Amino acid sequence: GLRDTRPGDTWLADRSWNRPGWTVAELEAAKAGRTISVVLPALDEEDTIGSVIDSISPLVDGLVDELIVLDSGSTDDTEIRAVAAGARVVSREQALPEVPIRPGKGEALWRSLAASRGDIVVFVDSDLINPHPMFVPWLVGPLLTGDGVHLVKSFYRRPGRVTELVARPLLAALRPELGCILQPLGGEYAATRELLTSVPFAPGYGVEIGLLVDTFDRLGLDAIAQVNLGVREHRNRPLAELGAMSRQVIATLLSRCGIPDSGVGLTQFVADGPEGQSYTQHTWPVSLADRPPMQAIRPR
Amino acid sequence: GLRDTRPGDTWLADRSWNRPGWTVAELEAAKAGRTISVVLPALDEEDTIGSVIDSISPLVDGLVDELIVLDSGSTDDTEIRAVAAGARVVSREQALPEVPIRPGKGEALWRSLAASRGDIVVFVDSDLINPHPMFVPWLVGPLLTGDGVHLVKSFYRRPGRVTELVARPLLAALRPELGCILQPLGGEYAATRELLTSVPFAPGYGVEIGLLVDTFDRLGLDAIAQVNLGVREHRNRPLAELGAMSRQVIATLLSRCGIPDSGVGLTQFVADGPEGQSYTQHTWPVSLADRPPMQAIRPR
Numbered sequence: 001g002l003r004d005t006r007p008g009d010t011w012l013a014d015r016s017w018n019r020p021g022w023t024v025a026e027l028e029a030a031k032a033g034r035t036i037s038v039v040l041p042a043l044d045e046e047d048t049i050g051s052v053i054d055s056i057s058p059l060v061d062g063l064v065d066e067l068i069v070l071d072s073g074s075t076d077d078t079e080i081r082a083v084a085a086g087a088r089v090v091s092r093e094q095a096l097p098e099v100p101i102r103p104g105k106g107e108a109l110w111r112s113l114a115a116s117r118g119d120i121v122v123f124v125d126s127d128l129i130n131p132h133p134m135f136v137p138w139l140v141g142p143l144l145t146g147d148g149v150h151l152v153k154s155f156y157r158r159p160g161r162v163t164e165l166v167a168r169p170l171l172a173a174l175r176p177e178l179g180c181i182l183q184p185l186g187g188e189y190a191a192t193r194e195l196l197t198s199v200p201f202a203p204g205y206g207v208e209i210g211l212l213v214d215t216f217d218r219l220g221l222d223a224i225a226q227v228n229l230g231v232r233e234h235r236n237r238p239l240a241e242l243g244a245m246s247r248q249v250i251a252t253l254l255s256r257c258g259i260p261d262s263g264v265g266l267t268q269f270v271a272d273g274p275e276g277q278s279y280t281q282h283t284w285p286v287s288l289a290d291r292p293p294m295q296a297i298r299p300r
Numbered sequence: 301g302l303r304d305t306r307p308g309d310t311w312l313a314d315r316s317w318n319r320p321g322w323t324v325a326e327l328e329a330a331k332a333g334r335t336i337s338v339v340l341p342a343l344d345e346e347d348t349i350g351s352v353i354d355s356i357s358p359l360v361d362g363l364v365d366e367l368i369v370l371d372s373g374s375t376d377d378t379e380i381r382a383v384a385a386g387a388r389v390v391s392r393e394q395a396l397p398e399v400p401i402r403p404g405k406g407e408a409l410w411r412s413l414a415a416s417r418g419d420i421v422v423f424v425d426s427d428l429i430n431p432h433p434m435f436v437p438w439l440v441g442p443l444l445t446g447d448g449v450h451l452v453k454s455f456y457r458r459p460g461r462v463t464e465l466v467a468r469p470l471l472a473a474l475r476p477e478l479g480c481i482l483q484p485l486g487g488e489y490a491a492t493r494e495l496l497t498s499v500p501f502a503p504g505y506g507v508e509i510g511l512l513v514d515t516f517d518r519l520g521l522d523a524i525a526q527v528n529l530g531v532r533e534h535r536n537r538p539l540a541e542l543g544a545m546s547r548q549v550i551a552t553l554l555s556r557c558g559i560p561d562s563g564v565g566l567t568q569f570v571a572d573g574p575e576g577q578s579y580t581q582h583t584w585p586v587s588l589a590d591r592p593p594m595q596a597i598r599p600r
Contacts, residue, residue: 002569002578002579002581003578004577004578005576005577005578005579006577155569155576156576157571157574157575157576158571159574161461161465162465164542164543164568165461165462165465165466165542165543165546166465166466166469166546168543168566168568169466169543169546169547169550169566170550172547172562172564172565172566172567172586173547173550173551173554173561173562173564174561174562176562176564179564179566179567180567182569182579228576230575230576231574231575231576242464242465243464243465243468243469246465246466246469247469247472247473250469250470250473251473254473259559261473261474262472262473262474262476264472264473264476264479265472266468266469266472266479267472267479267480268464268468269302269455269482271457271458274457274459274531275457275530275531276305276455276456276457276528276530276531277304277305277306278302278303278304278305279302279305279482281302286472
């Protein structure tokens with residue numbers, strides 16, 4: 001099982017595994033009228049985004065029906081670079097003009113539901129480095145092989161601190177059946193539109209874990225598969241942000257578990273100097289505000 | 301306040317500060333009949349323990365009435381090295397022979413209450429490197445200057461991952477008034493015996509945060525002071541243990557907050573190789589079992 005795993009392998013809930021034998025052509029044939037959107041959330045990702053798009057471009061009008069970059073207020077060259085590589089770029093405003101924007105990653109993913117039309121939506125972060133072209137096929141695989149899977153999470157080898165110290169231990173504590181999930185915070189995952197538009201979306205960095213727990217709570221572990229992506233490189237998230245990320249993962253998880261979170265942000269005390277003679281006090285915002293199911297806003 | 305702080309400085313709850321002007325002699329005079337124990341919990345600390353003891357030895361029979369190493373089942377030379385440096389060594393068994401031993405740090409600190417007699421107890425970890433001789437005087441300071449302080453936590457400049465990503469964000473969420481606590485997990489702190497023997501002790505790595513929250517819940521923030529220790533070096537805790545530590549901090553904190561923790565330990569999935577072709581599954585134990593107030597077991 002986890003003693004012999006090759007990129008593409010699928011772990012189902014009942015501890016059973018599957019090693020896919022389809023070609024991308026064969027996968028495309030298995031769509032059976034269903035459509036697939038790929039969504040790349042992006043915020044100031046000009047160095048890496050073209051490369052990510054390039055790894056997926058070759059599928060467009062084949063396995064992948066549409067490829068969308070959801071631009072979350074970039075001020076660098078993210079937009080023009082994405083267009084040049086052949087992706088459709090949609091801003092937060094364009095995705096859903098009739099709702100004011102809130103900050104954070106979750107907002108962008110939620111808005112991408114309104115911008116996309118695929119019966120299946122695959123999310124891929126636009127800060128991946130050298131992403132394997134099979135990422136998307138591997139993620140859609142368990143969805144097209146009809147066995148009641150609605151959400152496909154990925155796992156991978158880092159060529160993790162908030163995952164290993166915050167998300168996974170808090171899941172053991174509060175949703176222990178989800179202890180089998182190797183990468184609960186991972187930005188590479190696929191789900192059915194029917195699932196995605198039926199659940200609230202957590203704000204900021206709470207989005208991935210929010211979706212995992214909501215899916216589990218509503219459909220059980222059987223609706224969730226995990227796919228080995230193998231080695232996955234990406235850009236380093238800055239170390240300063242990790243406390244804020246942890247705080248938001250906690251807020252989201254507590255809220256899903258029915259535990260009142262204070263809504264008070266993390267105050268970090270940053271030493272001004274090596275002697276620890278003064279500290280700068282930096283309070284990061286945290287949000288308890290989900291977005292409602294997209295079916296409540298822009299229903300199909 | 302935190303804009304100009306020198307080792308020794310005390311932050312009280314009402315955001316007020318104090319810069320101590322006493323000599324160690326003057327502090328000793330202020331004891332007014334009260335006694336002071338220093339307790340060094342130790343587990344396989346033969347390289348560092350003599351040095352720690354040496355930093356405190358000069359106070360014994362003066363400010364410090366007794367210095368005890370609580371040996372938690374060392375199999376290296378911790379015991380003989382501590383004796384050679386002039387500390388009294390007490391095993392878990394010797395401290396409280398009539399109660400079976402449970403594993404973990406909290407057990408050792410709890411048992412040290414039975415082994416010690418001081419009206420004030422100061423805890424100092426035996427894996428400090430080059431600890432400043434004033435650590436103990438600085439920690440006892442706010443206790444001897446009678447203003448309703450019962451627990452003195454320290455803060456310091458690291459010359460932190462579970463503190464910064466787990467303990468402090470979870471405190472913001474569940475006990476936001478404790479957001480002002482810079483180092484909630486720190487092993488250097490002092491408290492009155494009346495407090496220490498009146499509260500349950502959390503197991504394993506939950507002990508420090510358990511005491512902080514119990515004190516806050518019972519006596520409010522006014523009973524808690526923080527003292528700047530300045531730069532504090534210690535030995536690196538191995539990286540593999542951090543998930544288990546986080547899991548226990550979570551269990552302890554949830555339990556104090558009235559939230560049912562599943563009691564399921566963290567399962568870590570450790571890649572066997574760089575390709576992520578197999579994973580080793582390692583499940584760390586977690587405990588939900590406090591020890592009762594020592595007053596219920598070996599009352600004074």
